[PDB]
A paper describes a structure:
For the levan utilisation system, the cell surface components are Bt1760 (a GH32 endo-levanase), Bt1761 (a surface glycan-binding protein; SGBP), Bt1762 (SusD) and Bt1763 (SusC)15,19,24. Recently, we showed that SusCD complexes mediate substrate uptake via a “pedal bin” mechanism. The SusC transporter forms the barrel of the bin, while SusD sits on top of the barrel, opening and closing like a lid to facilitate substrate binding.
Interestingly, while this structure is very similar to that reported earlier, density for the plug domain is poor but clearly present, suggesting mobility or different conformations of the plug within the barrel. While there is no density supporting this notion, it is also possible that the plug has been ejected from some of the Bt1763 barrels in the crystal. Consistent with the relatively high solvent content of the crystals (~63%), there are large spaces underneath the barrels that could contain ejected and mobile plug domains. Superposition of the crystal structures of plug-less and complete transporters indeed show non-uniform displacements of up to ~2–2.5 Å for Cα atoms of barrel wall residues, which is substantially more than the coordinate errors of the structures (~0.5 Å), showing that the barrels have subtly different shapes. The very similar crystal structures of Bt1762-63 in the absence and presence of FOS appear at odds with the dynamics proposed in the pedal bin transport model, but are likely explained by the fact that crystallisation selects for compact, stable states.
Author numbering:
A (entry chain A), C (entry chain A): 1 to 553
B (entry chain B): 224 to 1016
D (entry chain B): 472 to 570
Write the structure that this text describes.
């Protein structure tokens, strides 16, 4: 009668003292990749689409204002509360991603290179993933906790702060992870879920880019653009790095968002959503669940703005209408337009994802809100309703990979660092803009007959190659970001990185309000709404160890 | 303990035999694929003689598997031990009674890594309300059982695997075959992998009844019954890689569940009445029966930790399958009986029963069965006064019908099943309905459909058995010489069988049909002699000898040529006994080429082969050279029981015999041929080493050969043997402790017994198997010694 | 208490009176395709490989003679018994294929074209399948039962005969099925399991080809070559038919037998073995189970003959050694040889299925019989051991499609009809031989470096285009069949169709016996061993309705 | 067009055993009771199911896992706990006045 109290053993699990064993280390690695597919839900998408509703690219959509009103607050910047469940959830969910990356790192740290030669490669893979999650937390909250000690015991997590490091030192700690990945990932990864060395370079550049626009004040205002941080962006966007892993622009723009065309040369790193895979309904991108159009019965979230639509117009010789684009609404008949439009937003009268069996209409069939949020549809994450990749669970979803880094992003981030350095390498920066802008004008592979069938007048031209003043250059770079990356949920983060988020979002608020009534009372307050508040529940549980953001206490 | 077994070849005998089969075929025996090197040559008369043979230390060039002389049968068997304990208590009281039993039973089987245990509790009671006109009662019992069953055919596969393969590899891993050795896994290793597959079986069954007696002779009784059992288990699949045997790295677990609930209800009304001489009893009743069954499981592959604790479906990472179904049947039953006796001299009883069964369509759902039983007690008659040496002489005569209804619950249906192809199956043969119609190559749900399991029968009906027996039982002297002489004649009509279909009809042609008539008539005659000796000894000797002959009367023309009931598809068994067989007649062994030419031309005929008879004298041996060569009817069957009491000891012997009976077996294909088998190089019996040879010319056993050119696997008298036997089913001796010393302990009876089952067997000399009563097996029934007590307070 | 006897209903099935319903008709169709994958086993392969062991192409293999001795009898033509379980099984199994084809046909007959427009197409598909099965029974047994009434009730099957139709009328009944398929199948089948119109044409030609070599005597001897039957072969091998479905020769010969390359232009109809498909272990080609090499542990059946190996030699200008090929055994160093050899048989010293990580050796590792059956391996149905298509169940198997009709077969069957017609279209027949022979000489894509690494001297040349006498032409056609279709289990059927099966098999018996001792007592008896006996159990159950084959009673 | 069936099974077996010794005694005024004991307890649990999609006939009679044509999942686990218990009691009463 004490042998008796010890007989029953846990069933169906591994216990903490056996899980660091070598036989499980690659299991833990896969697990950390897995949570990027399985760790989000419809209100917490790791694409961050839910929060890019703040940007001038999209509306919230849905039945009306009452449908996710917590996301209507974000979209108009009024009524956001520190207590909101969605903010707390996205914070919680990305730190869960870090748990698996660290749990594997803890086990990988104990391996012998002599007996496990992929050690540093696998370690590189895990710090990459750890960087990806810290990076997104940083975009979302500014004042993040740097959880990068994988040998830290569960109790030491109670004494961490989000002010242990200055804003600049936080960005550096994210960069340090990506740095290790660059120095250790292989040049090619047969297994395409794992990032290659060029993916690490590209993310390392992206993070030194965001780190360059300093907010070293006590607030969110810009305190300068640091030269040497920009010079790291140039170093790690080097085409000689990108060539070594085979990355390049797709010959047609649409190929980045089509199931037939996953893992092309422009997909530098992507989340490998999958189907017919043993899981209950497929590792589909359930996070995009709310985004599908009303023609599937639900739910009609994430709808393009008339502003974004108008940004695609061109000027009789194939260039943006820099100061006039949004005066009149786009008219297919009389206006020149950019081919990227028809791969970004589905307009009425035109085929939904290239399928002339479904023509979008100004209908109760195509807008859940009977006109409130307009009648536009997000293409980049939806698919042909006849795809074999589309399944229904709680919501409709697909196996379409989500591209975290598109090779165009490398080219445009490289041009941004060059423009902002001003070493007379601005022309170099414009030929990179041209690489991206030329591809667009040729990307009519799937809509070549819209001139005949609908009267679309495509015209997009490269820029004349000459000297440009820097503010003019930036204006062209920002604009090329706009038409290349619409509805990819980076727009607001840019606006904040550039320090002009209050100015253009407010202008957009006054501008869009005439076309969409949810903005009638909108209002962005500077040095507050650039970032999400750190969740009240998180501050509460820290025992005074976390500090809030400027404008929030 | 297993007493004997078919002796199989050891590593040297196996090496000797293969050599003989080689040189018998004029082949270089040193070119064998199994690593034997033979020192041999020709004698003085020019005939192969084996001088010596060597064997590698290891079976494979890489030296992972050492050469062995394993006795596999001794390796997977052991002494079984059984232990039972039962404790009962009963209470008798004016106004009711109650009973209570606890029991335990634990079998460690004779087969390693098997075991079995049964907890049991019974509790019954009755309650006399309205004292002796209204009575309420109950029986209930409750059993928990748990067991690791052996795998099917574990023993035979241990006699099949050659003795050269070791139990353990060079390190401690499980041994196996390398190279050309048979594709058969290690039987010991199979048991170890089976050792955790344990089911847990819970069963309860009881009944509750009310009995109303409204006046003197009347009785109304209703009974409700319930029988619910459920079986639960996990079957574990572990990786293996033992020589060439391999699982790849498979691991899985199947969590199986089964349920059987059976409920019963009846009402019965009985009336008895007695008027001087006349006594009469009438009885009517009804009984509804239902049984509902269901099973289902979950299967999942790939487990990080190969232990039962870890291996639940939640923990698997590979693919999953889900299985399960259910079936059921219901029975309605109406019945009546009428007993009458004039002067305890003339008895008469009548009986009528309508039975209905959901296994038939409405058009044959019920069948009605009557009986008449008649009785005359001679010695009670007045004219029998004079015979004092005759205590009783009863003469009974009966006629009754009963029905057969044991068939599939879906016997009458054309059954289409979806059968996508999710169940294991050997070497193919899924018969799945899923197909890659698009050319994808898979990676998804395939389109699929339906396949036929059987064809229905709108006209399936009850099998009816009409039975007639007349009897004469007696007793003479003063109940010292009791006996009985019976004669029965049972004839079955519309016999039910699942009968397969013709080939060209194809998949799912099997049908449940009524097919023909049988007849079985015989003689039973039991005789006894009981008497004390007045010298302290009581003997009670009870015998029985029976004969029977069996015969098929009608058969649909298609079934008679099929051969289901006998005749092997070459002759109809109509007018013959059930299971009788037609085959070739084995006429010995060709001993010279002249004897080959001097015989009807037959394909494989050669020196040392089996000569088969030319039944029709056409000069060739072909498919017509067959006749009736096997009849299962024994000439008679007997049984004698000896009982002795002496000085409180008691001795009991039960003998049972069967005389003059054909048996038919495949055993000889393993014991008498190197090659009478689809799979090569298996271990064989030891009778081979007396096979025919120039060196060994006067033997019934054909010459060893690597090829069955002569088709000696043909149905022939070579496989028919004298299966007559006589055995001691049970012998038992016991001491009963005299109450002068036992009630010492406030205990009434106290008895010790020692008993033995299946100890002795006497066979025919020309029988060459293990046990003539079970001629298909290469192993006997193991002997049991038991020691027991029956203390009784 | 009669409502009570009716309550319990069958669980988990459909009953016979509901299965003809429209909602299930396409289920029945798929089911009839399915049994071509699921209805055979290791001893009864629908490739018929087990019975082609009679031919001069292969040995039985395995541990020795005792391993499937019933198939050793077939391989030496001595000791075959009418009672043998394998003969009965292959007869039973192909009639089960017909059951599903007929069960669907019975339901398809009741549909309305107005409401089910694919009716005749689906009916065509089912009679195709019905032809395929009768065709194979006919090759195997000659005297087959023609089960082609789908509305025939179960009892009428007891009165069928295999002598209701003459030998020629049986062939005609098989042709009539294929004829309907040709007139009704579509030209392209997106769903590639379903046969196209060209597949029906090709099978219709194959059956009129076999029907042309008349055995209208009471025995198996040839009683003539019927001209008009040949003219149907020419009509339905028409390149204008084959072009309309896109069929053609692969540019490399190896592509017909590689997983990477299923459903190419030369796969006119194939059995779609599949993997990761919901079934217990994959709809793999379990029928080839015994064929895998000893390097997988088992079982080393279906091994190429030294005769067949020698047939691949060439004559210093790239042509068969017609009367000398088998005098000396092939020596890679000093002999010219045909590239098809290295895609047919794996020899020691050379990579098993193109994988230099597994070099075949004269080893206990590569021949279960320690030399008895030689050391050669059948490539065409095995795969790279590193393939993802290879799984173990009871036996090792793969998802490699089995090609029933290769487009080369169309070309060579066309040339056979032309040679045998003799209308001075023999030259046409030789340019078709040349099409097949030219492709061979260029098929070094996967073994181009064997000249350097092993010293193989490839040389294969087309034939000079000129007038050829007909027996010379036939000699070249037979030979091209030999080197094109080795180990595809047609060799013996040809030999019988040509009426020369006793002559060459016997010659081969004397010839091969010096190299392989199982043939030392072999012996083919004319007008008997050309066909399998009808199974004794089948004759038994017919009640005198079936008659046996010549030489068997 | 989803259709599926899940066949769920659960088992709970709990067994208990005790021994207890009690002694009572009465001497005029004084009454006293002592009691000692022990109790072993165990409970073993287990559940498991089979899930399968796609059924031609949407009725319980038809919808068993054998009859499904889509994909399958298999679930199940178990847990358990045991308890040992030692105890004693002592009752005393002086004059049915003091307990
Ligand atoms: Mg994907
Ligand atoms: Mg005869
Ligand atoms: Mg395939």
């Amino acid at each position: 009668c004490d042998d008796f109290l010890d007989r029953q053993v846990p069933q169906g699990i591994v216990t903490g003292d056996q899980i660091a064993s070598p036989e499980y280390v690659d299991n833990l690695v896969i697990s950390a990749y897995a949570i990027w597919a399985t760790g989000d839900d419809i209100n917490s998408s790791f694409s961050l689409w839910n929060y890019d509703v703040r940007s001038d690219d999209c509306y919230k959509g849905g039945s009306g204002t009452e449908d996710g009103g917590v996301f209507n607050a974000l979209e108009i910047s009024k009524g956001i509360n520190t207590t909101d469940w969605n903010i707390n959830d996205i914070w919680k969910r990305l730190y869960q991603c870090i748990t698996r990356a660290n749990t594997a790192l803890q086990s990988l740290d104990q391996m012998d290179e002599k007996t496990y030669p992929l050690k540093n490669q696998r370690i590189a893979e895990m710090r990459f993933l750890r960087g990806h999650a810290h990076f997104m937390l940083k975009q979302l909250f500014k004042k993040i906790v740097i959880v990068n000690d994988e040998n830290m015991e569960p109790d030491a997590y109670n004494e961490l702060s989000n002010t242990t490091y200055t804003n600049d030192e936080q960005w550096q700690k994210i960069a340090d992870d990506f740095q290790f990945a660059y120095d250790n990932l292989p040049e090619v990864q047969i297994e395409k879920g794992r990032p290659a060395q060029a993916a690490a370079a590209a993310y390392l550049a992206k993070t030194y880019l965001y780190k360059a626009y300093r907010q070293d004040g006590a607030d969110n205002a810009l305190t300068g653009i640091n030269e040497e941080d920009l010079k790291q962006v140039v170093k790690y966007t080097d085409p000689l790095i990108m060539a070594k892993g085979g990355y390049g622009l797709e010959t047609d723009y649409s190929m980045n968002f089509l199931p037939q065309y996953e893992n092309g040369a422009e997909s530098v790193w992507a989340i490998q959503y999958s189907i017919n895979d043993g899981t209950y309904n497929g590792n589909l991108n359930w996070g995009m669940g709310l985004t599908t159009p009303q023609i599937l019965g639900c739910c009609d979230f994430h709808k393009p703005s008339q502003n974004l639509v108008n940004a695609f117009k061109t000027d009789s010789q194939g260039k943006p209408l820099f100061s006039t684009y949004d005066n009149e609404n786009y008219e297919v008949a009389t206006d020149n337009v950019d081919p990227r439009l028809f791969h970004t937003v589905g307009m009425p009268g035109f085929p939904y994802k290239y399928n002339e069996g479904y023509i979008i209409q100004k209908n109760d069939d195509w807008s859940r809100s009977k006109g409130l949020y307009g009648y536009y549809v997000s293409l980049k994450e939806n698919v042909d309703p006849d795809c074999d990749c589309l399944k229904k669970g709680s919501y409709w979803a697909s196996s379409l990979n989500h591209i975290v880094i598109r090779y165009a992003d490398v080219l445009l981030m490289r041009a941004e660092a060059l423009i902002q350095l001003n070493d007379g390498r601005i022309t170099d920066a414009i030929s990179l803009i041209n690489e991206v802008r030329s591809r667009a004008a040729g990307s009519t592979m799937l809509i070549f007959n819209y001139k005949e069938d609908y009267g679309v007048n495509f015209k997009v031209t490269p820029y004349d190659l000459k000297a440009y003043a820097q503010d003019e250059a930036m204006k062209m770079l920002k604009w090329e970001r706009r038409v290349e990356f619409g509805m990819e949920s980076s727009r607001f983060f840019d606006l904040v990185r550039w320090g002009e988020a209050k100015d253009v979002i407010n202008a957009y608020y006054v501008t869009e309000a005439s076309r969409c009534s949810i903005y009638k009372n909108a209002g962005f307050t500077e040095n507050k709404n650039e970032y999400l508040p750190v969740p009240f529940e998180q501050i509460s549980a820290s025992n005074g160890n976390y500090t809030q953001n400027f404008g929030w206490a | 303990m297993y007493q004997s077994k078919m002796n199989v070849l050891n590593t040297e005998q196996y090496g000797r035999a293969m050599w003989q089969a080689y040189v018998n075929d004029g082949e270089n025996p040193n070119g064998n694929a199994l690593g034997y090197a033979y020192n041999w040559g020709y004698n003085a008369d020019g005939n192969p003689v084996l001088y010596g043979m060597t064997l590698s230390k290891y079976l494979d060039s890489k030296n992972t598997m050492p050469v062995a002389d394993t006795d596999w049968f001794d390796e997977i068997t052991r002494t079984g031990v059984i232990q039972q304990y039962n404790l009962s208590v009963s209470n008798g009281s004016e106004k009711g009674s109650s009973f209570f039993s606890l029991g335990y039973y634990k079998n460690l089987g004779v087969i390693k890594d098997t075991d079995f245990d049964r907890f049991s509790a019974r509790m019954n009671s009755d309650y006399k309300l309205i004292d002796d006109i209204l009575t309420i009662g109950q029986h209930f019992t409750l059993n928990r059982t748990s067991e690791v069953q052996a795998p099917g055919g574990i023993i035979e596969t241990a006699l099949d695997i050659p003795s050269a393969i070791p139990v353990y590899a060079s390190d401690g891993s499980w041994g196996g075959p390398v190279g050309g050795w048979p594709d058969r896994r290690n039987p010991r290793a199979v048991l170890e992998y089976n050792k955790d597959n344990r089911y847990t079986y819970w069963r309860m069954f009881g009944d509750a009844y009310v009995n109303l007696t409204p006046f003197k002779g009347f009785n109304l009784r209703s009974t409700f019954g319930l029988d619910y059992a459920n079986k639960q288990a996990r079957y574990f699949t572990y990786p293996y890689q033992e020589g060439t045997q391999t699982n790849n790295g498979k691991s899985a677990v199947e969590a199986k569940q089964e349920h059987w609930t059976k409920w019963m209800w009846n009402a019965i009304a009985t009336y008895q009445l007695e008027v001087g001489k006349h006594r009469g009893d009438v009885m009517i009743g009804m009984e509804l029966n239902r049984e509902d069954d269901s099973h289902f499981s979950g299967y999942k592959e790939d487990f990080s930790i190969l232990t039962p604790d870890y291996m639940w479906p939640d923990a698997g990472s590979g693919t999953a399958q889900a299985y399960g179904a259910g079936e059921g049947y219901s029975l309605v039953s109406f019945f009546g009986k009428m007993n009458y006796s004039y002067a305890d001299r003339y008895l008469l009883s009548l009986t009528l029963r309508r039975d209905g069964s959901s296994r038939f369509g409405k058009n044959h759902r019920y069948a009605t069965f009557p009986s008449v039983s008649l009785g005359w007690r001679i010695t009670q008659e007045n004219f029998m006064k004079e015979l004092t040496w005759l205590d009783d002489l009863k003469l009974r005569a009966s006629w009754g019908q009963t029905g057969n209804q044991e068939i599939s619950n879906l016997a009458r249906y054309t059954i289409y099943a979806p059968n996508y192809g999710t169940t294991d199956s050997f070497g193919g043969q899924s018969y799945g309905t899923a197909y890659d119609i698009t050319g994808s190559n898979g990676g998804g749900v395939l389109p699929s459909g339906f396949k036929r399991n059987q064809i229905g029968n709108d006209n399936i009906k009850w099998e009816t058995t009409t039975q007639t027996n007349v009897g004469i039982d007696f007793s003479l002297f003063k109940q010292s010489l009791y006996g009985s002489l019976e004669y029965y004649y049972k004839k079955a009509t519309d016999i039910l069988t699942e009968m397969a279909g013709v080939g060209v009809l194809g998949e799912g042609g099997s049908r449940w049909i009524n097919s023909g008539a049988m007849k079985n008539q015989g003689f039973e005659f039991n005789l006894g002699y009981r008497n004390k000796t007045a010298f302290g000894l009581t003997y009670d000797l009870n015998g029985n000898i029976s004969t029977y002959r069996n015969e098929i009367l009608e058969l649909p023309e298609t079934v008679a040529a099929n051969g289901k009931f006998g005749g092997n598809g070459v002759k109809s068994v109509v007018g013959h006994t059930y299971g009788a067989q037609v085959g070739y007649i084995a006429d010995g062994i060709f001993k010279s080429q002249d004897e080959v030419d001097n015989h009807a031309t037959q394909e494989g005929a050669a020196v040392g082969r089996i000569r088969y008879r030319d039944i029709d004298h056409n000069g060739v041996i072909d498919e017509r050279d067959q006749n009736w060569i096997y009849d299962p009817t024994p000439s008679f069957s007997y049984g004698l029981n000896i009982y002795l009491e002496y000085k409180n000891f008691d001795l009991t012997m039960f003998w049972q015999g069967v005389q003059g009976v054909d048996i038919i077996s495949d055993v000889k294909k393993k014991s008498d041929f190197w090659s009478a088998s689809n799979v090569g190089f298996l271990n064989k019996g030891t009778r081979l080493l007396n096979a025919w040879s120039p060196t060994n010319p006067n033997s019934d056993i054909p010459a060893l050969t690597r090829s069955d050119t002569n088709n000696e696997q043909r149905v022939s008298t070579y496989f028919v043997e004298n299966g007559s036997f006589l055995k001691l089913r049970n012998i038992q001796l016991g001491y009963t402790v005299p109450a002068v010393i036992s009630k010492k302990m406030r205990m009434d009876r106290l008895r010790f017994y020692c008993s033995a089952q299946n100890l002795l067997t006497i066979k025919s000399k020309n029988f060459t198997g293990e046990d003539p009563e079970n001629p298909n097996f290469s192993y006997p029934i193991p002997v049991n010694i038991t020691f027991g007590l029956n203390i009784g307070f």
